[PDB]
């Protein structure tokens, strides 16, 4: 079953900034029917006149809606801790992020959290039989 568009495993690893504590790669589950969205190219093109373009720095962004683990303070899920995430889709694609940070957190009711993460780069592992190197 390789044509199913869905998420299989979500692993996160927090790192408290003020105490250096580290929590193993706990697993998570998603709150609703939405899926994470990704952006892996760290350059943005602006449209000039007559087909030209302009490049801008930009970053690599992630969006990870996940159910809060009842054994971790809600603050950690917001911008009070480092994050290291991994998402494994059903088809086989695996995408890893390290040294990410949360930006502009919004209020949450205690169960559903929608983290927005940014990192230098995101590594993608395509299923067997890729074309590009």
């Amino acid at each position: 079953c390789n044509k199913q568009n869905g998420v299989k495993n979500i692993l996160i690893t927090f790192t408290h900034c003020d105490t250096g504590e580290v929590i193993g790669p706990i697993s998570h589950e998603q709150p609703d029917d939405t899926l994470p969205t990704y952006k892996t190219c760290a350059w943005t093109n602006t449209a000039l006149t007559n087909g030209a373009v302009m490049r801008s720095a930009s970053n690599a962004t992630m969006t990870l809606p996940v159910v809060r683990d009842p054994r971790v303070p809600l603050a950690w899920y917001q911008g009070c801790a480092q994050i290291d995430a991994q998402v494994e889709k059903f088809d086989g694609t695996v995408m890893t992020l390290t040294e990410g940070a949360v930006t502009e957190p919004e209020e949450s009711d205690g169960r559903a959290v929608t983290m927005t993460i940014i990192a230098a780069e995101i590594d993608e592992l395509l299923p067997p039989g890729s074309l590009a190197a």
């Binding site: 900034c17 911008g79 480092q82 994050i83 040294e99 990410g100 940070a101």
Partner: protein, 133 residues
């Protein structure tokens, strides 16, 4: 700053002046070097001559939010007007000697009641002997 493990209280020194603590809100500075650029007449070449260091200058902004801010704010102004220069703990430039050159105190009763801002403009002041050399 990069990474989510930054700690602003650990990298910025606590401001002060003549020993009285105060809450800083901004930190600027100005450096340079005095030149003597000269361009000849009918010539395709120019010149230069370094002729000393330029006097620094610092500007800071302070905020008072605590209960009964007028007493503290109105009592801090009595220190800026004290005769002579004194030690200044710049939040980022470290301890230096400076003399206050101006200060504008902003306040309101209906637009913003309960917070007082005061801008400052410091100047480096190194003690000099009185016998002119």
């Amino acid at each position: 700053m990069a990474g989510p493990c930054y700690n602003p209280n650990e990298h910025y020194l606590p401001a002060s002046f003549k020993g009285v603590p105060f809450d800083a809100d901004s930190s600027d500075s100005e450096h340079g070097r005095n030149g003597a650029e000269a361009e000849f007449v009918f010539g395709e070449r120019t010149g230069y001559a370094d002729l000393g260091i330029k006097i620094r200058s610092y500007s800071i902004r302070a905020r008072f939010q605590t209960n009964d801010h007028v007493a503290l704010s109105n009592a801090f102004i009595a220190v800026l007007e004290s005769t002579g220069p004194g030690l200044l703990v710049h939040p980022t430039r470290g301890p230096v000697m400076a003399a206050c050159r101006s200060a504008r105190v902003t306040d309101s009763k209906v637009d913003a009641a309960g917070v007082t801002y005061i801008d400052i403009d410091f100047v480096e002041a190194n003690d000099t002997v009185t016998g002119f050399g």
